[PDB]
Enzyme design. Structure first.
Site, PDB file in Angstrom:
ATOM      1  CG  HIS E 202      -2.259  -0.908   1.122  1.00  0.00           C
ATOM      2  ND1 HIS E 202      -2.914  -1.024   2.100  1.00  0.00           N
ATOM      3  CD2 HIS E 202      -2.284  -1.882   0.333  1.00  0.00           C
ATOM      4  CE1 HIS E 202      -3.723  -2.018   1.796  1.00  0.00           C
ATOM      5  NE2 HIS E 202      -3.541  -2.503   0.609  1.00  0.00           N
ATOM      6  CB  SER E 206      -1.034  -3.036  -7.364  1.00  0.00           C
ATOM      7  OG  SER E 206      -1.907  -3.188  -6.408  1.00  0.00           O
ATOM      8  CE  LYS E 228      -9.051  -9.541 -12.931  1.00  0.00           C
ATOM      9  NZ  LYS E 228      -8.417  -8.681 -13.967  1.00  0.00           N
ATOM     10  CG  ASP E 229     -10.140  -9.865  -5.442  1.00  0.00           C
ATOM     11  OD1 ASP E 229      -9.955  -9.022  -4.368  1.00  0.00           O
ATOM     12  OD2 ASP E 229      -9.371 -10.232  -6.314  1.00  0.00           O
ATOM     13  CD  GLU E 272       5.507 -33.214   2.744  1.00  0.00           C
ATOM     14  OE1 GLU E 272       6.545 -33.802   2.893  1.00  0.00           O
ATOM     15  OE2 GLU E 272       5.395 -32.176   3.895  1.00  0.00           O
TER      16      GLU E 272
HETATM   17  C1  HEM Z   1       0.771 -15.421   3.264  1.00  0.00           C
HETATM   18  C2  HEM Z   1       1.715 -14.734   1.998  1.00  0.00           C
HETATM   19  C3  HEM Z   1       0.925 -14.150   1.093  1.00  0.00           C
HETATM   20  C4  HEM Z   1      -0.035 -13.595   0.679  1.00  0.00           C
HETATM   21  C5  HEM Z   1      -1.478 -13.994   1.362  1.00  0.00           C
HETATM   22  C6  HEM Z   1       0.229 -12.545  -0.040  1.00  0.00           C
HETATM   23  C7  HEM Z   1      -0.693 -11.633  -0.448  1.00  0.00           C
HETATM   24  C8  HEM Z   1      -0.399 -10.392  -1.294  1.00  0.00           C
HETATM   25  C9  HEM Z   1      -1.402  -9.665  -1.790  1.00  0.00           C
HETATM   26  C10 HEM Z   1      -2.936  -9.707  -1.381  1.00  0.00           C
HETATM   27  C11 HEM Z   1      -1.159  -8.846  -2.707  1.00  0.00           C
HETATM   28  C12 HEM Z   1      -1.973  -8.037  -3.681  1.00  0.00           C
HETATM   29  C13 HEM Z   1      -2.527  -8.584  -4.811  1.00  0.00           C
HETATM   30  C14 HEM Z   1      -1.713  -9.268  -5.851  1.00  0.00           C
HETATM   31  O1  HEM Z   1      -0.755  -8.255  -6.293  1.00  0.00           O
HETATM   32  O2  HEM Z   1      -1.732 -10.379  -6.084  1.00  0.00           O
HETATM   33  C15 HEM Z   1       0.379  -9.345  -2.867  1.00  0.00           C
HETATM   34  C16 HEM Z   1       1.290  -8.669  -3.711  1.00  0.00           C
HETATM   35  C17 HEM Z   1       2.637  -8.953  -3.753  1.00  0.00           C
HETATM   36  N1  HEM Z   1       2.939 -10.032  -3.050  1.00  0.00           N
HETATM   37 FE1  HEM Z   1       2.073 -11.152  -1.876  1.00  0.00          FE
HETATM   38  N2  HEM Z   1       1.411 -12.489  -0.754  1.00  0.00           N
HETATM   39  C18 HEM Z   1       2.067 -13.545   0.024  1.00  0.00           C
HETATM   40  C19 HEM Z   1       3.163 -14.369  -0.437  1.00  0.00           C
HETATM   41  C20 HEM Z   1       4.156 -13.624  -1.232  1.00  0.00           C
HETATM   42  C21 HEM Z   1       5.315 -14.124  -1.573  1.00  0.00           C
HETATM   43  C22 HEM Z   1       5.965 -15.191  -1.031  1.00  0.00           C
HETATM   44  C23 HEM Z   1       5.935 -13.260  -2.377  1.00  0.00           C
HETATM   45  C24 HEM Z   1       7.021 -13.295  -2.680  1.00  0.00           C
HETATM   46  C25 HEM Z   1       8.393 -13.037  -2.105  1.00  0.00           C
HETATM   47  C26 HEM Z   1       5.207 -12.239  -2.423  1.00  0.00           C
HETATM   48  C27 HEM Z   1       5.455 -11.019  -3.306  1.00  0.00           C
HETATM   49  C28 HEM Z   1       4.213  -9.944  -3.549  1.00  0.00           C
HETATM   50  C29 HEM Z   1       4.565  -9.116  -4.541  1.00  0.00           C
HETATM   51  C30 HEM Z   1       5.978  -8.709  -5.135  1.00  0.00           C
HETATM   52  C31 HEM Z   1       3.551  -8.071  -4.430  1.00  0.00           C
HETATM   53  C32 HEM Z   1       3.407  -6.951  -5.481  1.00  0.00           C
HETATM   54  C33 HEM Z   1       2.385  -7.537  -6.545  1.00  0.00           C
HETATM   55  C34 HEM Z   1       2.256  -6.559  -7.477  1.00  0.00           C
HETATM   56  O3  HEM Z   1       3.222  -6.212  -8.213  1.00  0.00           O
HETATM   57  O4  HEM Z   1       1.151  -5.947  -7.859  1.00  0.00           O
HETATM   58  N3  HEM Z   1       3.715 -12.218  -1.643  1.00  0.00           N
HETATM   59  N4  HEM Z   1       0.691 -10.532  -1.958  1.00  0.00           N
HETATM   60  C1  LIG Z   2      10.073 -27.405  13.828  1.00  0.00           C
HETATM   61  C2  LIG Z   2      10.325 -26.772  12.616  1.00  0.00           C
HETATM   62  C3  LIG Z   2      11.601 -26.742  12.012  1.00  0.00           C
HETATM   63  C4  LIG Z   2      12.556 -27.833  12.474  1.00  0.00           C
HETATM   64  C5  LIG Z   2      11.871 -26.295  10.871  1.00  0.00           C
HETATM   65  C6  LIG Z   2      11.920 -26.789   9.463  1.00  0.00           C
HETATM   66  C7  LIG Z   2      12.654 -26.193   8.279  1.00  0.00           C
HETATM   67  C8  LIG Z   2      12.583 -26.845   7.234  1.00  0.00           C
HETATM   68  C9  LIG Z   2      12.140 -26.103   5.883  1.00  0.00           C
HETATM   69  O1  LIG Z   2      10.710 -25.272   6.234  1.00  0.00           O
HETATM   70  C10 LIG Z   2      10.938 -23.858   5.933  1.00  0.00           C
HETATM   71  C11 LIG Z   2      11.225 -27.138   5.128  1.00  0.00           C
HETATM   72  C12 LIG Z   2       9.798 -27.250   5.025  1.00  0.00           C
HETATM   73  C13 LIG Z   2      11.766 -26.902   3.591  1.00  0.00           C
HETATM   74  O2  LIG Z   2      13.131 -26.652   3.717  1.00  0.00           O
HETATM   75  C14 LIG Z   2      13.689 -25.487   2.803  1.00  0.00           C
HETATM   76  C15 LIG Z   2      11.582 -28.103   2.470  1.00  0.00           C
HETATM   77  C16 LIG Z   2      11.579 -27.650   1.116  1.00  0.00           C
HETATM   78  C17 LIG Z   2      12.314 -29.267   2.708  1.00  0.00           C
HETATM   79  C18 LIG Z   2      11.885 -30.193   1.649  1.00  0.00           C
HETATM   80  C19 LIG Z   2      12.121 -31.766   1.975  1.00  0.00           C
HETATM   81  O3  LIG Z   2      11.177 -32.459   2.448  1.00  0.00           O
HETATM   82  C20 LIG Z   2      11.260 -33.722   2.762  1.00  0.00           C
HETATM   83  C21 LIG Z   2      10.273 -34.410   3.239  1.00  0.00           C
HETATM   84  O4  LIG Z   2       8.843 -33.629   3.139  1.00  0.00           O
HETATM   85  C22 LIG Z   2      10.189 -36.022   3.484  1.00  0.00           C
HETATM   86  O5  LIG Z   2       9.036 -36.616   3.752  1.00  0.00           O
HETATM   87  C23 LIG Z   2       8.488 -37.408   3.072  1.00  0.00           C
HETATM   88  C24 LIG Z   2      11.297 -36.464   3.497  1.00  0.00           C
HETATM   89  C25 LIG Z   2      12.562 -35.935   2.862  1.00  0.00           C
HETATM   90  O6  LIG Z   2      13.744 -36.685   2.577  1.00  0.00           O
HETATM   91  C26 LIG Z   2      13.979 -37.818   2.986  1.00  0.00           C
HETATM   92  C27 LIG Z   2      12.607 -34.435   2.586  1.00  0.00           C
HETATM   93  C28 LIG Z   2      13.630 -33.786   2.239  1.00  0.00           C
HETATM   94  O7  LIG Z   2      14.994 -34.239   2.078  1.00  0.00           O
HETATM   95  C29 LIG Z   2      13.614 -32.330   1.978  1.00  0.00           C
HETATM   96  C30 LIG Z   2      14.600 -31.445   1.313  1.00  0.00           C
END
Ligand code: HEM
Ligand SMILES: C/C=C(C)/C=C/C=C/[C@H](OC)[C@@H](C)[C@@H](OC)[C@@H](C)CCc1oc2c(O)c(OC)cc(OC)c2c(=O)c1C
Ligand SMILES: CCCCCCCCCCCCCCCCCC(=O)OC[C@H](COP(=O)([O-])OCC(O)COP(=O)([O-])OC[C@@H](COC(=O)CCCCCCCCCCCCCCCCC)OC(=O)CCCCCCCCCCCCCCCCC)OC(=O)CCCCCCCCCCCCCCCCC
Ligand SMILES: CCCCCCCC/C=C\CCCCCCCC(=O)OC[C@H](COP(=O)(O)OCCN)OC(=O)CCCCCCC/C=C\CCCCCCCC
Ligand SMILES: CCCCCCCC/C=C\CCCCCCCC(=O)OC[C@H](COP(=O)(O)OCCN)OC(=O)CCCCCCC/C=C\CCCCCCCC
Ligand code: HEM
Ligand SMILES: CCCCCCC[C@H]1C(=O)O[C@H](C)[C@H](NC(=O)c2cccc(NC=O)c2O)C(=O)O[C@@H](C)[C@@H]1OC(=O)[C@H](C)CC
Lengths: 61, 101, 49, 81, 380, 295
Positions: E202, E206, E228-229, E272
């Site tokens: 904000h 956007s 639209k949403d 997964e």
């Molecule tokens: C619980 C996490 C998240 C929720 C529920 C969320 C929600 C939002 C919402 C509502 C918007 C505005 C609508 C849209 O542009 O799609 C937005 C925009 C944005 N979000 Fe997220 N977001 C999430 C995760 C992420 C992640 C993981 C990234 C990447 C690191 C990200 C990057 C962005 C960016 C760059 C914008 C700007 C979008 C634009 O260019 O208009 N968001 N997000």
């Molecule tokens: C209490 C919380 C703690 C300790 C924090 C946890 C942090 C970890 C990360 O969270 C962000 C993690 C989810 C994320 O790593 C970046 C995933 C992409 C890792 C993916 C992942 O999955 C596996 C899995 O699901 C398995 O089961 C069926 C078995 C697995 O190998 C035998 C794996 C495995 O080899 C890897 C790399």
């Protein structure tokens, strides 16, 4: 004309609009559920406990 | 060898922003410099640029473009900001290095 | 000036009932809204259910 | 907070739009719509599809080459007694 | 003073400045609902989650049979479960595209908005991790055993850091409880951070397809983007339910229908689906630490993209070159994922090591490079 | 207003500037005007009105004397009926942030001289009245909209209007304000309209009536004014509507009526919008539209 008759009597007054949706959903529910169950049940004749039922429900003993 | 020319002329048609009737410079991402450049634009060249955009937007929202006829032709693209910008940058670079002295 | 300005031809998009520049849209209005509103109204029922 | 009003300085841009009740919802579904859908699809297919297609192969390939390495080579036992 | 309540009220003023009078670009495309949909996922996980927690029993001896019980005995419990579970997947789906968009239209220039995103993503991953361990199935167990163990890679604090995680010296009950408690809590943390994500956003309004000032034609969030949403709501909502009503366990490994066995790691153990790609990268680096590190950066690299932007233009809309690269990268992941689902043998192994080499390079090298090259072709 | 007209009636004739195109004025020929005079300036459609110290009969005489038109066929006696103009709820936005204030005009289709409703409408228009910086009344005025207008420095001025025509009309309102209040203003305005179609009271109409009666009189203040009224009474209404008459029609109108009538023409109707100047703040017709119901 229904669209006129409708808009004029139901959709216009934002207060009646509601009663329409409510009273409407109400009817919609019944009709839908009935046909739905129907469409399903038929698509599965003789496989549901509703069909097998009679062979044991007050038939033996 | 026109190679370089033949190429730029290509990529240009490739980017195809000209299909929105936008000028090269029209697309520049607005950073702190550009921002200043744009502020220096003569009022005509500016309101113009704007409309060109407000039109591009109108398109992009309709999911359409301009009839081929009105596309912008490579050789006719007017780098209306290129020079302004450059100066801006120049000014800065001088201020920047002058504060290291 | 503002005298040289005209609302372009929107026939391309106009609803059937208001395409003739010589017939009161007013009568065929009740309908145009009744419909759109109908859809919406329905959509509500849907949601509701 | 409120952003409508500061946005930007704009001069000379006349816009005309008609109430939604005076216009068609999804008009010129053919004459206009579709055509552009094709127009779009076209220009883009040659940028998107390429790589995917590329992968798919690398998928089929690896998948098969693996399966072949599962089958036995009768030539490992033409010496056996 | 003020005329219409909607603008004065301390609370409405908020609902207003972010759902009604909010300035939106006129041209933002489908790829812009993913933010809101992501929301809806969050709302749907927390809801279904509380419900499932009302019947769960965090405790090795009962954790399994509680879920079972919760599906068979609790009215519509099954439906709840199913929804919660696929919800997860659909969450990740929505999030991966939400990231996609961001990458291709350089929304990542909104740095903070972006960084927080990463944070959110990371969390989700963690969150979803513990969530899975709860049911205490075969996967639940062994996954718990691996993922946590990852930290054993860090020297010194390492072997200890695990200790905490498990609360024991091996993955046992203590883990399951604290993991539940954690899973219960975390979602809320996301919700919070999201609030921030949206705030930083904000500040700038956007982004938008063309990547040029939209101030010349903005539109009130309502009714435009509001309607639209809702459409985008039902649209996604469909396959989600479809999936969860007709083929619940489609996206879900069935080896997890076999109560954990601290003694037998299933011969065919695969993560997964939403983790597969990372799984792959780590599986291609044959070295405890390397594997771990590869993975780290496999996601942590996101933070960099913002600095690996070189194009004078912002979105790839007008950069055919970058585009082609982009999609290649999409597909590059799409591949990496496949591999994950494939055993450690030939060709698979090498094919993997490459895609991983592939991955990093597109992001760390080609992108910034094809980018520069690009401006010289436009002549800037 | 021309713009308002130009979109409110778009496509038809009404949507034309009385002054006409730049080209037509640049090319119009001796002939074309000659023709306009012949084609249009004709006895049956003309009306000689006079007011002051003058003997009706004496007048009619000098009339017979110089206004010597001779009508052979039935043609020269028939008043050509006009192709009804189509109303089109929509807008037209002429923007220029570089202008001091923005002007906004909104309206719904009007009935046309004929309709006895016009009365009511004017009564209504008297309730919302008109305001403008110099009025000394200020925060105290009786016009709801005027009050708020003052209280929050809404507009520099605003005005109600029911421009009538033979077959149609343009019932609405026009206000001029600083770029940064356009919205709040419009909002309160459209509200009043809504309040009109929903909760107008007996006390509200009682006044309007008395206000209207006065303008009614003030329109007939002197010779020219009267003559105009007559010139236009015969030409549009058919005959001459006396003040005694007008007055009955007004003492008639009461709450219920105003509500029904305004509702009749204002509620949930797609309106015509005209914006000129630095109008960024007021936006989306959709939103303006939504401001047509509930309140
Ligand atoms: C619980 C996490 C998240 C929720 C529920 C969320 C929600 C939002 C919402 C509502 C918007 C505005 C609508 C849209 O542009 O799609 C937005 C925009 C944005 N979000 Fe997220 N977001 C999430 C995760 C992420 C992640 C993981 C990234 C990447 C690191 C990200 C990057 C962005 C960016 C760059 C914008 C700007 C979008 C634009 O260019 O208009 N968001 N997000
Ligand atoms: C209490 C919380 C703690 C300790 C924090 C946890 C942090 C970890 C990360 O969270 C962000 C993690 C989810 C994320 O790593 C970046 C995933 C992409 C890792 C993916 C992942 O999955 C596996 C899995 O699901 C398995 O089961 C069926 C078995 C697995 O190998 C035998 C794996 C495995 O080899 C890897 C790399
Ligand atoms: C319904 C889909 C729209 C169909 C379409 O492309 O319209 C073409 C066409 C209109 O053509 P157009 O004017 O050029 O297109 C305008 C927009 O693209 C018309 O589209 P739009 O902008 O009005 O709608 C956008 C919509 C469209 O979404 C889709 O493309 C589907 O995307 C969203 O709202 C986001 C939803 C994304 C959630 C998907 C869940 C992913 C889970 C994966 C597993 O409609 C028809 O041909 C009529 C069909 C009846
Ligand atoms: C027993 C039978 C069941 C009973 C059901 C209970 C009834 C509940 C009462 C609902 C009252 C509805 C009244 C709202 C009226 C508001 C209004 O102004 O209209 C709708 C108004 C728009 O106005 P206009 O169409 O432009 O025109 C106005 C008319 N002149 O708001 C809208 O946009 C309506 C759209 C509604 C649908 C959106 C919801 C879609 C969601 C789908 C997901 C569903 C499943 C999951 C839900 C579970 C939640 C925990
Ligand atoms: C991660 C691991 C999981 C596996 C990856 C899942 C990949 C799913 C398969 C792809 C399905 C998406 C369908 C392809 C859409 C094709 C398309 O519409 O392309 C054209 C279209 C037109 O663009 P403009 O030039 O701006 O046009 C404007 C004027 N008309 O381009 C777009 O829609 C932009 C691309 C949207 C993003 C989609 C990315 C897919 C997701 C992958 C994840 C990528 C990010 C890396 C994250 C690291 C973890
Ligand atoms: C960020 C959103 C969330 C994610 C990503 C998520 C994901 C998961 C996952 C993947 C499982 C394993 C389900 C399975 O067996 O397939 C799970 C289980 C569970 N989650 Fe969540 N969850 C989230 C939020 C919540 C919430 C809000 C609660 C309560 C605070 C909750 C309570 C539970 C419980 C009790 C289980 C055990 C029952 C079951 O296995 O389904 N979850 N969660
Ligand atoms: C209660 C009122 C507060 C309302 C807060 C919610 C909100 O503001 O919802 C909005 C629709 C928001 N969406 C947007 O800003 C948005 C921006 C551009 C395009 C689209 N859609 C198409 O182009 C959007 O949908 C969006 O998705 O945020 C949620 C994530 C928020 O929810 C959270 O942050 C919660 C988890 C907590």
């Amino acid at each position: 004309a229904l669209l006129r008759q409708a808009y004029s009597a139901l959709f216009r007054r934002t207060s009646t609009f509601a009663l329409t949706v409510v009273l409407g959903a109400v009817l919609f529910e019944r009709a839908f559920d009935q046909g739905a169950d129907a469409i399903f049940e038929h698509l599965n004749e003789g496989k549901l406990w509703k069909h097998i039922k009679h062979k044991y429900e007050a038939s033996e003993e | 060898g026109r190679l370089m020319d033949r190429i730029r002329k290509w990529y240009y048609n490739a980017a195809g922003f000209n299909k929105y009737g936008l000028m090269r410079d029209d697309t520049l991402y607005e950073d702190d410099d550009v921002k200043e450049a744009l502020k220096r634009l003569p009022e005509d060249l500016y309101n113009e640029r704007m409309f060109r955009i407000k039109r591009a937007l109108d398109l992009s929202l309709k999911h359409r473009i301009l009839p081929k006829e009105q596309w912008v032709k490579y050789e006719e693209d007017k780098p209306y900001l290129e020079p302004y910008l450059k100066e801006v940058i120049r000014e800065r670079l001088e201020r920047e290095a002058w504060n290291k002295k | 000036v503002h005298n040289d300005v005209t609302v372009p031809d929107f026939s391309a998009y106009r609803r059937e009932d208001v395409m003739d520049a010589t017939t009161s849209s007013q009568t065929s209005s009740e309908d145009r809204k009744g419909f759109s509103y109908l859809v919406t109204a329905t959509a509500c029922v849907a949601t509701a259910y | 907070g409120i952003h409508f009003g500061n946005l930007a300085r704009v001069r000379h841009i006349i816009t005309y739009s008609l109430s939604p009740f005076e216009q068609r919802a999804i008009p010129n579904i053919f004459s206009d719509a579709l055509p552009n859908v094709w127009r779009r699809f076209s220009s883009q297919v040659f940028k998107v599809a390429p790589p995917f297609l590329g992968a798919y192969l690398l998928y089929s390939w690896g998948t098969q080459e693996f399966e072949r390495l599962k089958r036995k080579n009768p030539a490992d036992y033409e010496n056996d007694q | 003073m003020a005329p219409n309540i909607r603008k004065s009220h301390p609370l409405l003023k908020m609902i207003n400045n972010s759902l009604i009078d909010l300035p939106a670009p006129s041209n933002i495309s489908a790829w812009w609902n993913f933010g809101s949909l992501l929301a809806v996922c969050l709302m749907t996980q927390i809801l279904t989650g509380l419900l499932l927690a009302m019947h769960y029993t965090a405790d090795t001896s009962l954790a399994f049979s509680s879920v079972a019980h919760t599906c068979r005995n609790v009215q519509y419990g099954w439906l709840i479960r199913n929804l919660h579970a696929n919800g997860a997947s659909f969450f990740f789906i929505c999030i991966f595209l939400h990231i996609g968009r961001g990458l291709y239209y350089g929304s990542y220039l909104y740095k903070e908005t972006w960084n927080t995103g990463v944070i959110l993503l990371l969390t989700l991953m963690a969150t979803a991790f513990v969530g899975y361990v709860l049911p205490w199935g075969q996967m639940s167990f062994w996954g718990a055993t691996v993922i946590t163990n990852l930290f054993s890679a860090i020297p010194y604090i390492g072997h200890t850091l695990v200790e905490w995680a498990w609360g024991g010296f091996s993955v046992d009950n203590p883990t399951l409880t604290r993991f539940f408690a954690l899973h219960f809590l975390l979602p809320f943390a996301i919700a919070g951070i999201t609030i921030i994500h949206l705030t930083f956003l904000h500040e700038s309004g956007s982004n938008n397809p063309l990547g040029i000032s939209s101030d010349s034609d903005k539109i009130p969030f309502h009714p435009y983007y509001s309607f639209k949403d809702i459409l985008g709501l039902t649209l996604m909502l469909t396959p989600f339910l479809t999936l969860a009503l007709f083929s619940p366990n489609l996206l879900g490994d069935p080896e997890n229908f076999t109560p954990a066995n601290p003694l037998v790691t299933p011969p065919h153990i695969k993560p997964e689906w939403y983790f597969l790609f990372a799984y792959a990268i780590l599986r291609s680096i044959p070295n405890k630490l390397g594997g771990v590190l590869a993975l780290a950066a496999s996601v942590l690299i996101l933070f960099l993209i913002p600095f690996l932007h070189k194009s004078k233009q912002r979105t790839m809309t007008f950069r055919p070159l970058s585009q082609t690269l982009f999609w290649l990268l999409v597909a590059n992941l799409l591949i990496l994922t496949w591999i994950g689902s494939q055993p450690v043998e030939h060709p698979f192994i090498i094919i993997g090591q490459m895609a991983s080499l592939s991955y990093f390079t597109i992001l760390l090298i080609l992108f910034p490079t094809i980018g520069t090259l690009e401006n010289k072709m436009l002549n800037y | 207003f021309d713009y308002l007209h130009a979109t409110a009636f778009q496509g038809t004739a009404l949507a034309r500037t009385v002054e006409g195109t730049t080209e037509n004025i640049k090319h119009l020929t001796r002939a074309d005007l000659a023709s306009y005079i012949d084609t249009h300036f004709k006895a049956p459609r003309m009306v000689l009105a006079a007011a002051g110290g003058i003997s009706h009969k004496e007048l009619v005489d000098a009339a017979r004397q110089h206004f010597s038109g001779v009508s052979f066929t039935y043609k020269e006696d028939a008043v050509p009926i006009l192709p009804r103009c189509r109303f089109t709820g929509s807008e037209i936005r002429a923007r220029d942030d570089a202008l001091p204030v923005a002007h906004v005009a909104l309206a719904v289709e009007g009935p046309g001289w004929a309709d006895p409703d016009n009365v009511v409408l004017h009564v209504a228009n008297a309730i919302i009245g008109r305001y403008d910086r110099t009025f000394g009344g200020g925060k105290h005025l009786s016009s709801r909209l005027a009050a708020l207008a003052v209280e929050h420095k809404l507009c520099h001025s605003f005005q109600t209007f029911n421009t009538s025509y033979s077959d149609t009309g343009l019932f609405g309102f026009h206000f001029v304000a600083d770029p940064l209040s356009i919205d709040d203003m419009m909002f309160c305005a459209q509200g009043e309209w809504m309040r009109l179609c929903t909760s107008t009271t007996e006390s509200e109409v009682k006044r309007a009536k008395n206000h209207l009666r006065s303008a009614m009189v003030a329109q007939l203040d002197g010779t020219t004014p009267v003559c105009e009224t007559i010139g236009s009474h015969l030409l549009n209404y058919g005959r001459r509507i006396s003040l005694e008459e007008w007055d009955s029609r007004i003492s008639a109108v009461d709450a219920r009526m105003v509500r029904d009538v305004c509702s009749k023409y204002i509620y949930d109707k797609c309106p015509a919008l005209a914006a000129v100047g630095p109008i960024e703040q007021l936006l989306d017709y959709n939103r303006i539209r939504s401001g047509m119901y509930w309140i």
